[PDB]
């Protein structure tokens, strides 16, 4: 699959980082939400 | 035709419930059978026994235009389907055709050989 | 099956699909409905000759599948409409490789006759494309 | 043995191949089979029963694959609706996504339609597209186990083949 | 390096005898000319019989537990829950310690089949098994 | 299963039982009828199996004889003028000339 | 990771489940015949009728569980079998897996078993609807007519042969064997005196349809002297022959569907048949007619326009939907609902083997369960209040709250709520018809989902609500556990079948 | 009947139609004996009008034998009378007679309602008394009962064994022209 | 009839024809003759035996569980059943509870092992 | 079983699905074919004999019968 969006330059990305902006990235599930976590299974046992 | 608002005496001769000989009765909830209302039973067994009196009565009874439209409804449906077939043919869409694109193989049918 | 290798490719086995002509499809279908007896005969002959002379101690083991050679030649003549020789050895050079593949897949790697039909029809299609 | 039904039409039949003239009303079962019942009833009559079963399965998978294309483009549009505000969504969508959406439209994909009306050439093209995808995923042995059933020895041999192929492709000059 | 280590592991597995039936099964699956066709057929039959996982083991374990419960609830008069629970635990532990109907009359036939070929020191065995490693 | 004698014996047993039920007489009535019915049914169905095999064999032979009759009827059913036509001249002369050696 | 074991698992389970049902039926029949002289019920506790009921109900239930397992085995086998042909792209090797027959039991009728998804869906409907119907017939089987406790086992065996044979003649025969047990049930088990004429009408209508199907199959057999669908694939019918065949099969299976104007028998029978058979008649047998039509038409190339058949089906839908307001009898109203649903399903099979049979199969299952639930509710009402007409019973919700709640939730499910499977079938069929004919799709949706629904809800809402003032001394009790659990199982299936694997839908 | 290089190929059996006619006649005779064996088992004077099918309403054997014989006469499958009509229609299709098939279907449906119409009359308000009295008790003839049992077996399950009868009749008819 | 080895000589054909019509090796010929080029008859027989045993185990367990569940939970009304179950020894109550569940559960477990492929050896 | 051990097809199918067909063809297909191929087999034998003489007959070339 292709990128589907108009490409931007690394100089533009550096400029945006200079202006205080942050690149959006997905965040991992917390231990409570993650169904493969000791916290999840301790909650289940409780 | 419509019901008569006038008060009428209860019917003396009306179709009633009849059971097969040697019928095992329904004994649910203590086997309590109440006497049936004559007017209610008459309405129960009225439509099933209603008949037309003379030839052609079915046309003019009620609304002649509505009866004609109801009678011609299958023809109207077929003609509308023909118009839609014209539209699909002009546009190469799904037609009213028996699409034999599987060459006879059935839907998820097992096709295995015996040794 | 109906794929041609891409001559200039970024990877080893990139292929591109193609569709045969309606004339080729009609010809192959008609001949297969007219010459399908020979193909079933080749299958049954292969099985019977393996039953008879398959054992190495048999007298006819050295003859191999030669009794089915007549069936193969008859199938070739029927599929080619008696215009490209009386034997499959007289096949045009375009269908030579496909004929070799058919013979291998029919008598050396005794595959089910579906693959053998694929290769024989490939021979017929090559001949048809050469001499449409 | 296949038979036939007696015909009632009084129409002459002329065969150039056999140089014979026949009447439709007077035909035996074999003559009806070779003259009246000689037409085709499937997209690829040149294929065997097994080959056309494979062709039909690949055609169904291809229709579902085009529907999968449309569903994926819809999911990416939904993703754009969330990750991109409306102030600039339509520009980025008209960049590349809108063209693909219109490419995967009512005639080009079956969608919810009862029958995808394809000619035999179109069905063959769809099946060839499916076969190209199958070839490019099987050269790397990706079919097992989602799209293929292979024994343990077959899996090991395929792994060795894919390893050799990967080494050869990695050690090729860039274009 | 890594491929050399994989080949060394293959040779080490060839040296061992526990993995030897498995390696010969891999050889047989390849349909190579190293193994005779009759040997292939017999080894396939014996290996299939030996590696069967029948449902009769679970059925017998189920029948023994239910049979014990029925017997102790049918004929014993005024049963003691302590002894009944101890017997349940003992039978479950015996099921745990009992091997799943392991057979010994099929593995020796496998060694009869594959002892005809010196798998440890066969140049063809390595060539066949170099490609096919699970 | 495989034995028509045993099939007939079972048929006779069940026929006797169903005749007892149908007559409303109790089972175990006229007990000698059970073995008698078993023997009669077994013999009858064994003979019918043999006779059907014989009839099938002789029917195959009669069909071999009948194929000649159908050919010679088709040649005799030709409409006037079709005997010497190109589609039937060879067969007509084979049967009229070659097959005339009495 | 699909191996040879699962293939034999599925095949063995199918064959040996048929033999399980047959052996249970045979043992039960032997016990029933050889333990009594007259074979009528001895009116005492120590009677074989208790054992007969137990054996038949348990055979149905356990064979249904085995059928669930075998259906899952078949689903896995069919998925992986279609995968194997699709998987391999090398031209040298083809999928050639030749199977051996089992040793313990023979092939019944010397026919190799062929299993399709529609056939096994039909078999599952047979099992469940027969279970519900036999549970609804215990109060009807008594002295001198207990012999019909085996009727649903006979139906299960007949349909088991019906949906598993590739022989066209055995297929037709198994389709033809469903008449005698049905007529015997209607003639001897029905309590209403008007049910004799209803049985006669059912027999004559369904047998005219069977005669048309017989003519079609006679054409098929005589023209191409064979009995196999593959041999049909190797033969082509001329345009006139194909037209005659399609007309005959459509008209016959529409006599059994039923279709306009051949639903008079269905109305009369449903009004007069016993509630158990009415559950079984509407739920299942019409689906056997649908399966027969699907098997016949898919295997034959037809070059005529199906607009006439589509018009007949849509006219049936409209005609059934417009008559729902004028029905004061709840059972007759449910019969008209059955007619509407059956015509809608039969519409989906007018496009050959396109992606329209999926909605037909799903709607067949949904209508089976919905008709079973509705006729069971009518049975509960008739057993409680001793009437079915709207003018005699109303206010059920206040005296029998569980029955009223069941009626209301039945209406909710019948209204095509998205959570259930009726909405899925409507979505399938209506999307296909809208792409085929938008105006006819709107007409069908308007008449069926508004006018018919309005009438259907009017006749049920008036029964549910009101005041049961008259006959307070004779007012019944609430729903029993059997009826409650049957209704809950119908609801549970209609809800959870939406989560079935989408591979086959 | 085809010809290839003066060699005739014959895929049709000329004697098959006569065998079908014989099978139809034999099936009708067998079903006619079945219905009239029940009549001869009873008081023959009890059956005068068509409404007096109620007289067959007796112990279940007579009742069910009557109703199944009537269904077989009407051609309801899989009873013995259905097989003859099915084979006749199959042969007519083989002979390519669509109009004859249509008229056979008309006659079959009309006669079928003619037969099953009497099934309504079998309903009786009580069990009937149609057996002759010998030695102060009803005379039930075991021999006729056994005959009816055999006829009922060959009427219910006769479709399973019809192939052997077809073979015998085709063998008999094969002598007509040879 | 004419498809036979009689009258055939290797000298009547060219070497290419002889080579391309030659028999394969003994192993290939035996595999083709026995129809065991992919799966052997012994593998098929083992699969059939396992399938039959699985069906019989599943059917027997389902029958036992169905009969035990009904014959133990259908002895009367709610109060009557409560009294009957209370007036039981502990092993009898355990049997009333354990037996119907164990048989059906084991049948379902056998079905689950049937539909699954954990035995595949290509694992790491 | 014993009733249906005479043909590998069920008795119902034998009774109804074989309309106007020779019982030789139904029960002994190989003998039926070899009997109808009597002249063709002789022509094929003559063709083989002439082929061994180096004389290829084009007319009887299609006649290559296996059964
Ligand atoms: C597949 C389809 C095709 C069918 C294939 C099978 C053939 C049919 C077989 C049916 C019956 C089998 C079970 C028999 C059960 C049994 O044990 O019964 C004993 C039972 C005796 O009862 P009982 O109470 O013990 O006897 C005491 C009484 O007092 C009465 O005693 P009695 O003192 O009055 O007289 C004693 C006499 C009583 O028995 C008789 O009198 C027999 C009369 C039967 C009717 C006439 C047929 C025979 C005609 C004359 C033959 C003469 C031969 C040469 C004789 C030379 C010396 C005189 O003999 C016996 O009781 C001893 C047994 C004698 C032999 C029985 C069998 C006879 C032949 C049956 C087949 C007939 C031909 C069919 C076609 C064959 C083609 C190859 O016998 C009978 O009931 C009559 C005979 C058997 C039944 C005949 C009628 C058959 C009806 C079915 C027709 C099927 C149609 C199929 C086509 C359509 C569907 C596909
Ligand atoms: C190799 C593996 C094979 C596996 C199995 C495969 C299937 C086996 C063959 C099944 C063939 C069935 C064909 C349909 C026949 C329907 C005719 C009918 O309605 O008969 C009523 C007749 C019983 O009539 P009823 O209602 O008892 O009448 C009362 C009595 O008249 C008056 O009662 P009563 O108290 O006065 O007197 C009692 C006495 C009344 O006496 C009689 O009815 C006389 C005739 C029978 C005498 C006893 C047997 C003698 C031997 O006896 C009876 O009523 C019992 C009759 C026999 C019942 C047998 C039930 C089990 C099936 C046995 C099949 C045997 C085939 C050979 O038979 C049945 O209802 C049998 C059940 C339905 C068939 C079996 C279940 C389905 C199995 C799968 C079917 C697949 C079909 C595929 C296509 C087949 C056609 C091409
Ligand atoms: C006369 C007796 C037979 C029964 C019919 C009685 C009259 C019914 C009727 O339509 O009345 C006209 C009208 C009612 O007619 P309507 O306006 O309801 O018309 C019904 C038909 N549609 C709706 C289609 C237009 O008046 C009455 O019913 C009131 C007086 C009744 C007689 C009192 C004495
Ligand atoms: C030599 C004979 C060996 C077998 C003998 C078996 C005898 C017992 C049969 C079973 C039995 O008791 O059934 C009671 C029943 C009694 O039938 P019944 O109709 O009298 O009983 C009804 C009355 N009540 C309800 C009180 C029981 O008999 C049968 O079911 C059939 C009896 C005959 C069985 C014949 C078997 C074959 C014999 C072959 C002989 C050669
Ligand atoms: C507690 C409840 C009461 C007690 C119930 C006991 C049930 C025992 C089994 C009942 C068997 C019913 C069928 C009777 C006939 C029979 O045995 O048929 C099975 C068949 C016989 O073999 P045969 O046909 O001779 O072929 C030789 C090939 N080996 O083939 C075989 O025998 C081989 C397979 C083994 C046997 C299969 C049995 C299947 C039973 C299905 C359930 C029946 C339930 C009946 C009601 C309870
Ligand atoms: C009652 C029992 C069934 C009777 C059916 C009688 C059918 C007679 C048909 C006669 C005929 O020759 O019809 C031909 C006609 C047009 O066929 P056409 O497309 O021209 O064929 C050319 C290629 N075959 O064919 C048609 O127009 C089709 C005719 C269908 C008739 C209705 C089918 C039965 C409905 C009940
Ligand atoms: N079944 C019916 N058919 C026609 N008109 C009716 C019917 N029931 C009620 N009506 C009309 O509704 C009115 C209500 O009358 P009702 O209250 O039943 O009688 P009363 O006023 O004597 O108590 C009547 O005057 C009558 O005109």
UniProtKB/TrEMBL annotation, chain C:
Source organism superkingdom: Eukaryota
Disulfide bonds: 35-78, 45-68, 105-116
Name of the protein this chain belongs to: Uncharacterized protein
Taxon lineage: Eukaryota, Sar, Alveolata, Ciliophora, Intramacronucleata
TrEMBL record, chain G:
Record's subcellular location: Cell membrane; Mitochondrion membrane
UniProt keywords, alphabetically: Cell membrane, Electron transport, Membrane, Mitochondrion, NAD, Oxidoreductase, Respiratory chain, Transmembrane, Transmembrane helix, Transport, Ubiquinone
Membrane topology label: Multi-pass membrane protein
Domain NADH:quinone oxidoreductase/Mrp antiporter transmembrane: 167-451
Annotated transmembrane regions: 12-34, 54-74, 117-137, 146-163, 169-189, 201-224, 244-265, 300-321, 357-382, 403-424, 436-463, 484-504
GO molecular function: NADH dehydrogenase (ubiquinone) activity; oxidoreductase activity
Keyword Transferase found: no
Function: Core subunit of the mitochondrial membrane respiratory chain NADH dehydrogenase (Complex I) which catalyzes electron transfer from NADH through the respiratory chain, using ubiquinone as an electron acceptor. Essential for the catalytic activity and assembly of complex I.
Protein's name according to its UniProt entry: NADH-ubiquinone oxidoreductase chain 4
Source organism (scientific name): Tetrahymena thermophila
Taxonomic lineage: Eukaryota, Sar, Alveolata, Ciliophora, Intramacronucleata
Gene name tied to this protein: nad4
From TrEMBL, chain H:
Family matches, as InterPro entries: ND/Mrp_TM
Database matches in Pfam families: Proton_antipo_M
Keyword flag Transmembrane helix: yes
Single GO MF descriptor: oxidoreductase activity
Keyword Oxidoreductase in record: yes
Ranges that cross the membrane: 20-41, 61-91, 97-116, 136-153
Protein keywords: Membrane, Mitochondrion, Oxidoreductase, Transmembrane, Transmembrane helix
Residue ranges of domain NADH:quinone oxidoreductase/Mrp antiporter transmembrane in the record: 22-108
E.C. numbers: 1.6.5.3
Name of the featured protein: NADH dehydrogenase subunit 2
From TrEMBL, chain J:
This protein's name: Uncharacterized protein
Organism field: Tetrahymena thermophila (strain SB210)
UniProt lineage: Eukaryota, Sar, Alveolata, Ciliophora, Intramacronucleata
